[PDB]
Symmetry: D2
Subunit: 351 residues, 4 copies
């Protein structure tokens, strides 16, 4: 068949070992009538991929180990390789450049039929991004321009997450924006905050190289979230508290700092995957009654793929995609991932 | 001058005494050019009035005792008694039935000029509701129909709070609504949830007489918030978790129960005044990341007075105003208040 | 097979004959794996059904005559009679009470994947409402309560149209509402305007019996749209121009009158199917620049079915469904339809 | 007193003469307690100023000629020169850089107290922009940064109009935008469409130099609105019809072309001042029923001043302000205005 990567182990806390990723052989998949097979050209690696591997997994930890070796990868671009007859009839053709949405909506539960497909009750997940060929239902497949640079469109899915979070934070003309975390999603939020009219953008992180990267992506200020007094410096710099707070570190200290930074009537969005003891103490009197704060979550996003595809030419990923490796050299890619030095890493899957 | 009530003491925790209200003599107030004097006909008593008196007041407790005896009352209807020359020019005339907004916006700070007058930086408060005559700036004075029953329009201000909270919870066609607290604001939210298309309305309280009152105001279900298992019964009755949660008890257990009841993508609104240790622990992973919950505060409301005045004929206050006393018998009114038995109490101020 | 009604002719303007409806024999349909067959119990007849038959059809007129005899009917309730294997797996079972959505979304065009399924590019329409058994894709089938009165749930689809139009007009607390047309959709908008907090509701029609029906459904005022001066009486009665205008007659005079009634910053919604020369002259200077009016269209609605199903117990259809006939007596039902006397007519399909 | 410009004549159609602007002497104005006197440093000239002078004025034409010589100018920046005692108490001080809002809201009519101050019933207008010193109520005066370049902040008011129109057109991530008119407001909409995430921006005008200017301000395409076939080229270039249409020419042909360009479910905003016979024929069937178009007006904007002030550093006015003259040379400025060659002209008022 073909080359595919699988998660072979996850973080073992009672031996102190990290998770592993290994290439195995897999048979060539075949599409049914409504399905489409992609030849994958670029796949990107995500923070959730890293959490599976190096992360603290909750009651969920037993279940996942249950099913290793596990296919993964949900951020990918490539070219249609083969089309079922129904899909051909809906216009999909071999040779079309596309991206795929890992999530399969059932279209016949209540959430689905209220438009809330990201809350689908019979949600399917097709996680074969890190495969040379992958099959999806035609509803998951989205065309992109014929002249598209596939490397950048591999980031379509994480851009949807960033777009949903920005929209949920209500970034708009003249607002001040605080972004917790200078990772890949962070850098996309910086760019999107600019493209939503934000007049002040401040990024917070521990790592100083990443603060420099935030400024390169368009942030006005970039601050160390570990230095004490940081809240007041930040409020000073923005002339007041922040209208929009976006929490992407998944850490409870950043989350609490986010809430503190939030202006009266402001919108805070917690979109990271959180770990153990993930409590945000909200003060009913001061945060809510006196300050009228709005605290939101964010799961998956819905209906964002076409939008995201339209935004790609407005984004500059030369400031976000910081490493590219070949599938052959996947081992180095995952070393780079585990280093946590890089905003986004892509793998070129046909090499 | 005239009869007016003042708060003469507040809750003394280091002697275990309750707050007191006493009538004193006060001079007749006189309006400047832009001001208007009202002859007050009905005044209503509020939950915040009760918190001053019988309540736990925080670092705020020293400040308030600083300034006793203190005028109070912010829910009132009556008739214009005298008009400054500028106000007459804006159309206000002696004999007009009106209600007053206690809050005075400065109109020249940033919040004011962003439309967020409820967050005014130089906020003024005119708290002389429990006075036979009171003066306000013309911007605070709102006319009501010539044939209006003044008793019901005394509830205009608390209806604005209820309207803002309902709107913030996004009550709309086909949503399920959970209301924590079967007090006056609670009963108004029941009526307003009906008038916003809610298809399931469940009220929660400790007191059983109040649960009966909720059903009389239009609630579908009324449940005891102290009985264990109540969450699951409630979710059973509504066929699922609640789209809209409205927290008006000011208690942290009701607040936590509210969050638990809240559906995925639901809106919870915390509009009560909270007491000591008012912490809502929010789980970032389950409440926010997985469930996409929206948690909101609510302070004062903005631009709601004309709306509220238009809604009065749609409301039925015969199910909410449960006691009327004369100003002469104010002492019984405040006994009734301290009993906490009644949804709303009104005082007729010209008797 | 079974009994089914078909449109056998449409309005012939060059002979002055009306359209006809006739029962024919049809084979029993069979569901594929993802399909479901309904035994139809109640079917309702619509204004669009009447326009096909007695109406002026545009360039569209040649196309439709092309394909007579034509199945029709898109408003129906009944019971699941047979389930394909995939659908059974998604939980649909014989014996379940359901309603059907005539519209089939493809789920793989751009509108579909932006959430705008009512603008689907490969839209399918299953118009076999007036059939004893009909087949639909499982995505079109919605369950209703086990104890549901099927007669009322036959109106689920037109309630979705009414719900979308009300939402598009932004009916909400304290708004004034003008509804053009006292037909079935009109009566549903009256009820929905009440359930959205409207403080003034005025219905306009030519026919006086229908104005009485508007008052019975909850309208505050009901006026004759042909009497001259009607606009000013209406504005008088509402204390001003209308915040929400809903145009359901499909006539250009009602449409123009609607725009005139509309308040500054108001929302007018044109949701009827219009005939020949359907021009609304909008004055850029007075309607738009000075008055800041918002003029909207409305096609089909999207994601409204679950909502509508939840609203049914809040509606009172004893004031809307004014005639019920048996399928056997369909000929009288269509006479009643062509009379235009009745708000809604239902046919009981198993008799 | 001081130098001030007045409109001395308007367009005389029954002699074919244009309007005139002349400097006269005016006394120094004095602020009351709540007022503030500005020393004006920069004033900008507007399209409405040009319509008074060279324009077709309707039934309004007799009224305006009634009151010549008339003060004008409503786009200005400068420095506080003197403060009434109440205003000083609200924090305004001599030496503060500011801009002024010409519009005075009464704060005590129904529109005002519903938040719709741009629809104020007792609206006041202070049109003395083209004066060396002007007085306004403190509510009209907005501070800007101490280091602000006053020339650019003179454009605060027209930016508010552009911001309101953009918001009303719902410009947001991934939308296509059509702007009719490559004037100053046009160029600001180009910049704002970029800063709201628009993925395609096309400007339409007659004049080719102005089309080049649109491309310099960030438009993707710039097309001649007089060339036939232009609609289809534009739809070709954008891959479909436009989500957002903004009509700023005030001409009925551009308005009609705008509606034609508008996508299904799109938002068109007509914010220009229109002339004689300003009719937009809307087709109820095709524009509204089938296409679900949304057509909006726009008057003044509300609560936009602080926002606009925050956006100024995000805008680049070196591509918009194309001429600066001294008050001394005002005659050339108005020649430049009447030439209609330039996007925006500013006058430096202390020279
Ligand atoms: Cl703040
Ligand atoms: Cl929200
Ligand atoms: Cl849920
Ligand atoms: Cl109006
Ligand atoms: Cl379109
Ligand atoms: Cl809208
Ligand atoms: Zn589903
Ligand atoms: Zn991802
Ligand atoms: Zn203020
Ligand atoms: Zn109150
Ligand atoms: Zn489709
Ligand atoms: Zn229908
Ligand atoms: Zn006003
Ligand atoms: Zn202007």
């Amino acid at each position: 068949g073909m080359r595919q990567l699988f998660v072979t182990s996850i973080r073992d806390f009672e031996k102190n070992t990290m998770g592993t990723v290994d290439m195995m052989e897999a048979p060539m998949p075949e599409p049914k009538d409504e399905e489409i097979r992609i030849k994958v050209v670029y796949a990107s690696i995500c923070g959730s991929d890293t959490h599976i591997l190096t992360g603290n997994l909750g009651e969920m930890e037993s279940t996942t180990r249950s099913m290793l070796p596990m296919s993964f990868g949900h951020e990918l671009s490539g070219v249609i390789d083969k089309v079922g007859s129904t899909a051909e009839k809906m216009g999909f053709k071999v040779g079309q450049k596309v991206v795929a949405n890992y999530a399969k909506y059932c279209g016949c539960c209540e959430n689905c039929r209220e438009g809330k497909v990201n809350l689908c009750s019979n949600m399917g997940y097709r996680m074969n991004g890190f495969s040379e060929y992958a099959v999806y239902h035609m509803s998951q497949i989205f065309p992109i321009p014929d002249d598209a640079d596939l490397k950048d469109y591999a980031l379509v899915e994480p851009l949807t997450v960033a777009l949903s979070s920005a929209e949920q934070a209500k970034i708009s003309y003249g607002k001040s924006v605080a972004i917790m975390g200078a990772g890949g999603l962070g850098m996309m939020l910086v760019q999107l905050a600019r493209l939503a009219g934000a007049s002040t953008i401040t990024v917070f992180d521990i790592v100083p190289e990443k603060l420099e990267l935030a400024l390169e992506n368009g942030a006005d200020y970039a601050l160390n979230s570990a230095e004490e007094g940081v809240a007041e410096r930040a409020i000073e710099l923005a002339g007041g508290r922040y209208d929009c707070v976006l929490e992407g570190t998944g850490a409870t200290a950043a989350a609490k700092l986010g809430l503190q930074l939030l202006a009266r009537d402001g919108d805070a969005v917690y979109f990271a995957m959180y770990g153990k003891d993930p409590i945000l103490p909200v003060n009913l009197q001061s945060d809510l009654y006196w300050d009228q704060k709005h605290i939101h979550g964010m799961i998956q996003g819905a209906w964002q793929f076409p939008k995201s595809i339209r935004m790609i030419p407005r984004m500059d990923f030369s400031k976000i995609i910081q490493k590219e490796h070949t599938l052959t050299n996947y081992k180095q890619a995952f070393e780079d991932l585990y280093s946590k030095k890089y905003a986004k890493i892509v793998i070129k899957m046909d090499e």
